[PDB]
């Protein structure tokens, strides 16, 4: 509350560390469904159904331009990529499996870097 604060966690490295995580997600072999925005002209249903599209290149641009206020808003966009994927793709599909795999890979790096 006013004039009452928990001890200050060092957040000076968070930007660099989120960039590293994102590099690792970008270079994963199952990243291909997520590298670029879904083409809303060429994929019927996507625009109407997925209210907030998100992809790794859009996260990279937001990160590089100071549009993440903190590490949690960064994790929310990464998770949005996978939540979108599950909303639109059957579990038993190449893309549906890719999304589960990448969400696992992410959540481990996240815990190991920050928790």
Swiss-Prot record:
<feature type="domain" description="Bromo">
    <location>
        <begin position="9"/>
        <end position="113"/>
    </location>
</feature>
<comment type="subunit">
    <text>Component of the BRF-1 ISWI chromatin remodeling complex, at least composed of SMARCA1 and BAZ2B, which regulates the spacing of histone octamers on the DNA template to facilitate access to DNA. Within the BRF-1 ISWI chromatin remodeling complex interacts with SMARCA1; the interaction is direct. Component of the BRF-5 ISWI chromatin remodeling complex, at least composed of SMARCA5/SNF2H and BAZ2B, which regulates the spacing of histone octamers on the DNA template to facilitate access to DNA.</text>
</comment>
<protein>
    <recommendedName>
        <fullName>Bromodomain adjacent to zinc finger domain protein 2B</fullName>
    </recommendedName>
</protein>
<comment type="similarity">
    <text>Belongs to the WAL family.</text>
</comment>
<comment type="function">
    <text>Regulatory subunit of the ATP-dependent BRF-1 and BRF-5 ISWI chromatin remodeling complexes, which form ordered nucleosome arrays on chromatin and facilitate access to DNA during DNA-templated processes such as DNA replication, transcription, and repair. Both complexes regulate the spacing of nucleosomes along the chromatin and have the ability to slide mononucleosomes to the center of a DNA template. The BRF-1 ISWI chromatin remodeling complex has a lower ATP hydrolysis rate than the BRF-5 ISWI chromatin remodeling complex.</text>
</comment>
